[PDB]
Structure formats: C-alpha cells, structure tokens
C-alpha cells in the first residue's frame, strides 16, 4: 500500500533531480530517502527511478506514476486546507492560469477583492490557456484555468464555466497602409503575427479569413506570447488579432491603431475550466466568485 | 493505520453504519482502526464520526472529508491498476545479441533452463559483435549484448559486466604444413582467414604479430562471418584465429587441426553489455543469469 | 582541371566525337581539356580515347571508365541536388525564446531589421525563462534562448555568449508608503508580489533580503506572469522585483513608482543559450547580431 | 564542386570519429584536414561534422551526403580496377555477403577455385540475407549477395540471377516427441524456433502452416543466427525449418533428426543480387562464375 510521506518525498526528487539533492530539501537522511523510495519500488515491483550522470531520472513507470501521485498529493493538501477554511481559518494555496483579456481588466481587482476578504489564502497565477492547461488540471497543480475554448471541444472530464464573452480586434502600426480599410478582403494581402488561439497559432484570422471566402492568410509570424505581441506589431508592418482588452492595456497604444473594419470578428467565450470530479475548495470557489464578479 | 486502509475503512462505515461492522467486513482489528480514526480526527481537530443508537454517522465535517477520501482511494486504485498493467506488459520480450563461444556452448542449455522459468517471454537472439552493437545497444533496440570487448575501449554510456574468459586459438586445414608449428615467427609468412574481432577484422593475429616483433600478417582473405570461417579454412592453406568453442563446435572438425603454439595468445573478456541508464527486465535479469551459470 | 569537368567532358566526348566540339560546348579551354584528358591517361595507365577520321572514340579501356564516370557524375548531381533540398528548408525558420527585457526594447527593433536582411525566414517567438527552457532546447524544439541565468549554474549541454546586463529595480504603486525608502531593512515588512528568476520565484529579492542581514520577505502573491505583474502592483500595496525594462515599458506607468534605494540589487546577465554541439542556422546567426546590435 | 580526396577524407573521419585521429591515418596535418573539410562545407552551404564530446559526428546533411560519397568514392575505385583487369593485371577487392546454404556448401570449393585463378585479388565474405543488404548494394560497399528471395518482389533497380534451388527441412533434437511424424498437422501444437527468412522470421513456417489450412505456428523463440539455430534445437523441444544443406552441416547432427514428412515444403531460390546500373569488375564476374559452378 502507498505512503504519502513518500509521494511527497518521490515529487520533491523529481523536481530536483538527484537523490542527494532532495535529502537535504526533506531534511533527511541520504540513504533514509532510498529506503522509502525502496519500499514503494519493492511493492510496486516496479523500479521508479534510474541513476544517470545528473543524477535521478524516472523510469517509464515513475513518470506514468507521477501524474496519480501529484493528484492524491495535491488533493490530500486541499482536503486539509478547506477543512480549516470551514472553520473560518483562511489559510491554503490557490494555483490558477488565466488569459490576457482577464489578466488585464478583471484580475487586479479581482485578486485585490479575495485579498481583503481572505488574507491568509495564498494564490499563485499564471499565464495559460486551453488545451495546455489540461493536463495540470487533470494532475491537481492547477486548481482550475480562465481560458478561452470552444464548448463542443472541450474534454468530457473537465467542467467549463462561462465567464466573459470577449471582443476580437485587427491591430496595426498607427500609419500603417492599410490603417483605414473597411473590409477584411482589403487585408488579404498583408502580413500577420499570428497569435495564440485553443485551435493554435493565427487560429482566428486563419477562420474569419476562410469564412469571408479568402484564401489563407499570410504568415508573418508567429507570436505565443501576448506580452510581445503589441510592441512587434507597432515596430513593422505586421496585422494580428488582439483582445480589445489587449488592444486598450498594452505599452505601445499611442503606435498602434485598430482597424475600423465593418466584416464582423468573432467574439470567443472565456471560462472558468476545472477537473469536474474533483471537489473545489471553498477558498478557490471564493476567488472564482471575485473574478465573474469583476469580468462583467 | 496505513491512511489508505482508514480511509477505505470510512467508507465502508459510512455505508454499513458501524465502526465495528466495518472492520469485521475489512478483516481489521476493531480497536486498531478506532484508535486510527481518533488519530486522524486530532490530526484535522474536528470529528468525523459522530455516535447514535444505530452505529455511527458521518459528521458535517465528515461529509466534507469523505469526498477526499473517495477521491484519494480512487486514485490509488487507479495508480495500481495502471503500474499493473504497464508491469504485465513489461513482465514479455528479451532482444540481445550474442558472440560465437556464448551462442555455441552456453546459450542453448541457458536458454532451455530460462525457458521452463520463464514460459510466457519471447526471446530474440542474434549474432553481434562490438562496437557494432554500440548504436543498437543505445538507441534501445537492442537490450544487451554478450560480446568480446576491451575493458578501456567501452563507450561511458554502457555498463560492462565479465561473463566468460576465452581462449584464442590458431587453426588450420588438418595437413597443414604449419601443424607442428612452436612459435608465432614459424607462422610469419603464412597467409591468413582475418576473422571478426572488436578492433576490426584480423586484429588479434595483427596484434600479435606486432607483440611479438614480427611484420605485419599477410592478408589471404577477410571472412567476418563465423558461420562460414571453418569450411573456408578447411578448404584451403590459409590459418585463421577463432574462440576454442568455434575449434571445437563445427561442421568440419575432421578437416581441421588447431595449432598449439608455445607463444601465449590473448584471452578475450566477453562481457554483457548495455546502457547503465536503463531499466532491466526480471526476466532479461533472469536470462544473464542463466547464461552466466552455464558459462563456466 | 577539376576532375569533374574531366569526367563530364569525357561523357560529352563520347557523345559528340570530338574533344574540341566538347570543349567549346561546355565552355572549357580546348588545350586545358586536351592537358586534363592526358593527366588522368597517364594516372590510369591506359588511353581513353582514339582518334579517328571522324574525330576521336573511347577505347576498350575509356568503355569500361565511361561506366564508372557517368556514375560518379550522376552522384555528384545527385549530392548537390539532396544537399539543395536539405539546404533550401533550412534557410527557412527560427524558433526561440525571450526574456521581457529582450521582448520590449531589443525585440521590436531587431526583428524588423532581420526581416529587411532575411525576408523568407519564418521566426517563431515565445516567451521563456531558464531553466524552464532547458529540456527544449536540449531535444532541439527551441533552437536558441534569450533569458538570464547564472553562469556556473547553466547545463553543460549548453553554450552561454553574454547579451545584456540588466537592471532589477523594486517597484509599487505610485503612492506606496515606503515610496521613499533609502534602505532595503526599511521593506523588510512589506509583502511582496514573487516575480520570476532563474532560481525561482521571487529568488531576487529573496537572495536580496538574505545578503542584506534580514529575515525571508513576506509572501503576497505569486505572479509568474510578468505581462500581469505592473497591473497587479498597480492596483495593490505589493512591493515586486522587475527589469527596469518593464518598469518603463508597461500599461500601468502613471499608477507606478519604482524605489530607488541605496543598496544595491543584483545586474542579472541576459544571454543568448543554446546547445553547444548543434550547428546554427545563417538566418538564427543573423538574428542573435541583430538582437545584440540593438542591446547596447 | 566536390574534390575526390576529400571524400575519401570524410569517409575515413566517419569511420574512425575524429579529426586528429583521421588525420593520423592520411598522414595530414591536423589543420590540414578542417581546411579540406571546411572547403567541402564552405561550398555546399552547409556543415557535415558537428563537434562532440567523443570527437566529430555527422550531422544531417553529412548522413545524407554519405552514401552518395561512398558510391562516388568506390566507383572511382572500381572503375581504375577494372581497367587494370582489362590489362590483365588482376589486381582489387571484391566483398559480398551469402546464405547458409551457399556459405555450407558452394562457398569453400568456388573461393578455393577463385583463389587459384586470381591469387592477388583480395575478398572479403560476410553473412547476409535481402533485403537488409539492400542499401549496402546499392552505395556500393557490398558488390554483390547471395541470397534468398522472391522474384516478384525485388526492388526494380535491382537485378537478380538465379544461383541454387534450396530444399527445406524441419528440423527438431534426435529423441523429439514428433520425431516420427508424417505430416504437417501432426506438430500443430509444437514451439517452434523462427529462423530467418526474406519475407521475415518464421515466414517459410507461417506460411507453410497457412496454405495447409492450418492455424499461426506456435512462437517458441526468434532465432535469428543460423550459427546458433542448430543446437538451440538441440538442447530443447523446439522445431525449426533450416535450409537442408545446413541440417546436413552443422556441429549437432549426432543430436538432430528431419521429420520425415510426407507433405510437401518450399524450395526456395537463391539469387546472385546487384544493384543493375553498376559494371560488374571482371574479377566479381570471376568469383561469380565459380560460385554458380559450385552450385550446380
């Protein structure tokens, strides 16, 4: 039968490396380690780790174990905290991704709302989006994800939530040549960055494009990240697709210029996406509440 | 206690309404599991448990906790069940290479005894030489190697464990003018069958020529394959060098005379060979042992 | 010479029946191709061609020559049409990673430069940090990354060439409390908002804190995101560490003040990492010139 | 354009894995062989050798370029060969690979006769079977196998002459349960070793038991070493099928017994296979000749 200490112990090896290394972080032993990593191999029958030139690494069963370790780990850990949260003891850990739209306009305030009214909790957020988040959601170390994805798409083990339908812009450089068209034809053959998107890079301008009865859109490159994103465009010739969030919260506003088109853009929903059967503590539902409260 | 036999124990109490039923139907002794569940009730200083006429029922903060507890034994089933079967997959293939002395004298009486230990693993076996086997060996399609090798010249990828020591001996067609030879020089201007070696084809003959002052042999032919080299010494006037077991195990043994020279020759090291990073089957495990009880 | 020519003037020879008409046709000097013909005669020991009325022939010797020259002819088109497929692909895409200090004032200007010189190279930007971006560029899918790091810290795998030194600078709301704090000792209650570092998040000011004689800093919040990071700050009484880049380049600079203390904080190195033992591309050459051109 | 000298330059680098030891064996200066090195890649716009810890290895474009530098590279060799040869100097290499049953029987007596014709060429014999020898064929390190397969499948660029109809026996130890067995139903239920084959291990047995109506053989084990194949049968209860020269020729016979069945099995055709578009070296015709001799 499984230990939890080891798990624990087995998850601090893997984040480090080398046996010797997580000995010192678990304040143990350098062969009590190996006893305990020894006993789960021995019952197990199966060898977890192997020893390389850089010290441990997991066996094809340690890392097909990982996943179902990091999730009794983490939920033993939720189980705790929301326990003493329902007897008014705020104190555990929230871990969370979210999207730039929400980022931007929703999040601050939001998070400084939960602060005032939970002060002990402590939140951890991160960018990310569907479907790279899933495999964290599935896992436990993300408590949930506020990502653009499509209904019909998404995993039959995840629940997704609405929380904020956005708005999709067409930004350039303030002068550039096509700063006053009116109809995507018109954009047919400019360059793009293409942006990230739950169908993939350019994913938007790729479907409105085709939708519109246009050949593909041409490749100009392609940006993941969000936070470059604005300063590329208004530094070239480059279109892309933004947020209108993004559009309005972003460094380089006053070089930069949406373009006034009349072709309707799509306008992608965002939701609050989770592992359904795993039960939400009350601490993160707390915080979910203050970001729908803020995204509307 | 073991935190997953109290949790499976509370939900059996939660479904039978009884602390004692619940370790009767458990097999579990009936004070052993109170005294576990008080414990992790301190632990999460609140009561899961709460007593009435009929048994017992679960707590407010019981309710709660259960939800973990259901979720926690899930998964640990779940993580049995998968190691399970990725360990009954793994628990059914052996591919290795083997030089002529193991093929010929020690694997088919290890493979018979492996074979009745061992009922349900499908062995492949071919023939290998080092370094050829190097790149197989590392790339993983190859398992091990039992091969001749020289202890310094082994790649740091690969572990070298000794199986058997060999013996080398000088061979010619039965009439040979040399049959009667003492010394390696008497041998100087015969013409040569320069069989397989690890340092490439004649290097055991060219390097004792070297070591023993004398030219290089003279080239007759290149024959790397062991199968062939008897009958083609047996066929001409040309000497060869082979292991004792080939001398000794072969079509044409009423053809041939090994020639017993009072120069010593080398005694190639056949080891087992393989990446020391990865992971060995029980199995394979078995097998080397196998080979190695029957290479003595 | 060239043997080449030779050898493909000879087929051109047997096919119009002249070495003159040869030579004229493949635009070759009609005496240096008589001189070249009879150099590879002379090597060759035999005569290639016989004169006759008509012109010349290929003797015996120059037929059975002529085989091997077409073959050697064809491969050589062979090998330069391969290595012209496999060229033409390369000379075609980059990916990489970027620390913000890069992204926001480097980035923009650099990539519009590249595109001027390498207008058919598609580059793929993302955002990434070390040693987050490790194992990619190790199996190969981030071809380079810009990104601090700790010298003696780096993967041996790795090459490490010196970028930018970066500024860290601390930063708050524009009426923060301690806005005027000459001392690092006078933040030592403040909470903090951990950004990311190399070691770790929030490592800069936890590193900061430790030198300076005082106790761990106190948590707020993680936020690994740094496109969320001013936002955050802005509308918090978070102290956070940033590059002074995304000090001055980010959507919540009039809500912002950075403390310019007395004691010093660390210069992070910004440098350009990537597997030593991988050859890099003319276009990923050109791009890392043009990302340092405009970090200085 | 490519220089001849440096593709033998190349070849010998990738054999030996570095410059300085490559550089010792075409007695060159150190730097000397990178100026030549580096030309060829200068030229082809691309690099063939990376750096490693061990020494140099190809990269991408120098695997690719390879077998067109040894196609090249053994051409010229040959094509100077032969025209020697047609002066009746019968001077070169030859090397090519055989089956068992060519290697048992034919080869001993035809390298024999060759060896007495033309004592100065020098040949080199190895095991093989098609359509592994395909690629080596057809770069032109191997100049010819003998071979088992079947007409309808070789590869158009192949050409492939009749050399010897083969009988199949099957095969199992002298004291075999089925030793007295009449006909192929009768070992339905027995453990067969599958020895190797054109079309795959055990295809001339699966394919057998198939066309008798029967079910898939029963796998005893994967044995792909003829030398071995023997007493592997031996030592155990398995059944083989072996080409009937080698149950004739082999160091188990006293051990071994044909099953005397009275259903027919294939006779499989041994081909002498080449690569067509290549000119045979009077000398390769030579040892083919006595081959087929032999083999009739």
Same mark, same amino acid.
């Given at each position: 039968?499984?230990?939890?200490?080891?798990?624990?112990?087995?998850?601090?090896?893997?984040?480090?490396?080398? !046996?010797?290394?997580?000995?010192?972080?678990?304040?143990?032993?350098?062969?009590?380690?190996?006893?305990?990593?020894?006993?789960?191999? $021995?019952?197990?029958?199966?060898?977890?780790? %192997?020893?390389?030139?850089?010290?441990?690494?997991?066996?094809?069963?340690?890392?097909?174990?990982?996943?179902?370790?990091?999730?009794?780990?983490?939920?033993?850990?939720?189980?705790?905290?929301?326990?003493?949260?329902?007897?008014?003891?705020?104190?555990?850990?929230?871990?969370?991704?979210?999207?730039?739209?929400?980022?931007?306009?929703?999040?601050?305030?939001?998070?400084?709302?939960?602060?005032?009214?939970?002060? $002990?909790?402590?939140?951890?957020?991160?960018?990310?989006?569907? /479907?790279?988040?899933?495999?964290?959601?599935?896992?436990?170390?993300?408590?949930?994800?506020?990502?653009?994805?499509?209904?019909? #798409?998404?995993?039959?083990?995840?629940?997704?939530?609405?929380?904020?339908?956005?708005? %999709?812009?067409?930004?350039?450089?303030?002068?550039?040549?096509?700063?006053?068209?009116?109809?995507?034809?018109?954009?047919?053959?400019? +360059?793009?960055?293409?942006?990230?998107?739950?169908?993939? /890079?350019?994913?938007?301008? +790729?479907?409105?494009?085709?939708?519109?009865?246009?050949?593909?859109?041409? !490749?100009?490159? %392609?940006?993941?990240?969000?936070?470059?994103?604005?300063?590329?465009?208004?530094?070239? $010739?480059?279109?892309?697709?933004?947020? +209108?969030?993004?559009?309005?919260?972003?460094?380089?506003? $006053?070089?930069?210029?949406?373009?006034?088109?009349? #072709?309707?853009?799509?306008?992608?929903?965002?939701?609050?996406? +989770?592992?359904?059967?795993?039960?939400?503590?009350?601490?993160?539902?707390? !915080?979910?509440?203050?970001?729908?409260?803020?995204?509307?």
């Amino acid at each position: 039968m499984l230990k939890l200490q080891t798990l624990q112990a087995l998850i601090c090896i893997e984040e480090v490396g080398s !046996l010797r290394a997580a000995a010192q972080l678990l304040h143990l032993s350098q062969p009590a380690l190996s006893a305990a990593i020894q006993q789960l191999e $021995d019952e197990l029958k199966a060898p977890l780790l %192997v020893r390389t030139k850089r010290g441990v690494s997991l066996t094809s069963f340690g890392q097909a174990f990982m996943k179902h370790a990091r999730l009794i780990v983490t939920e033993s850990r939720r189980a705790q905290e929301e326990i003493g949260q329902l007897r008014g003891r705020w104190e555990g850990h929230i871990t969370f991704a979210a999207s730039p739209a929400i980022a931007l306009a929703a999040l601050p305030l939001a998070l400084a709302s939960f602060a005032r009214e939970f002060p $002990d909790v402590t939140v951890n957020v991160r960018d990310g989006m569907y /479907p790279a988040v899933s495999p964290q959601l599935r896992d436990g170390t993300l408590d949930f994800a506020l990502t653009a994805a499509h209904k019909h #798409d998404i995993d039959t083990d995840l629940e997704a939530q609405p929380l904020y339908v956005s708005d %999709v812009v067409i930004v350039g450089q303030r002068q550039h040549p096509m700063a006053n068209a009116t109809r995507l034809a018109e954009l047919q053959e400019c +360059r793009w960055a293409f942006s990230s998107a739950p169908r993939g /890079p350019g994913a938007i301008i +790729r479907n409105a494009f085709a939708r519109y009865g246009l050949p593909e859109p041409k !490749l100009g490159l %392609v940006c993941e990240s969000f936070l470059a994103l604005p300063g590329v465009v208004a530094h070239s $010739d480059l279109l892309t697709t933004m947020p +209108r969030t993004l559009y309005e919260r972003n460094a380089f506003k $006053d070089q930069l210029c949406s373009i006034p088109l009349q #072709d309707a853009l799509p306008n992608p929903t965002i939701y609050v996406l +989770r592992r359904h059967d795993l039960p939400v503590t009350p601490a993160a539902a707390g !915080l979910i509440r203050w970001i729908q409260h803020h995204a509307l």
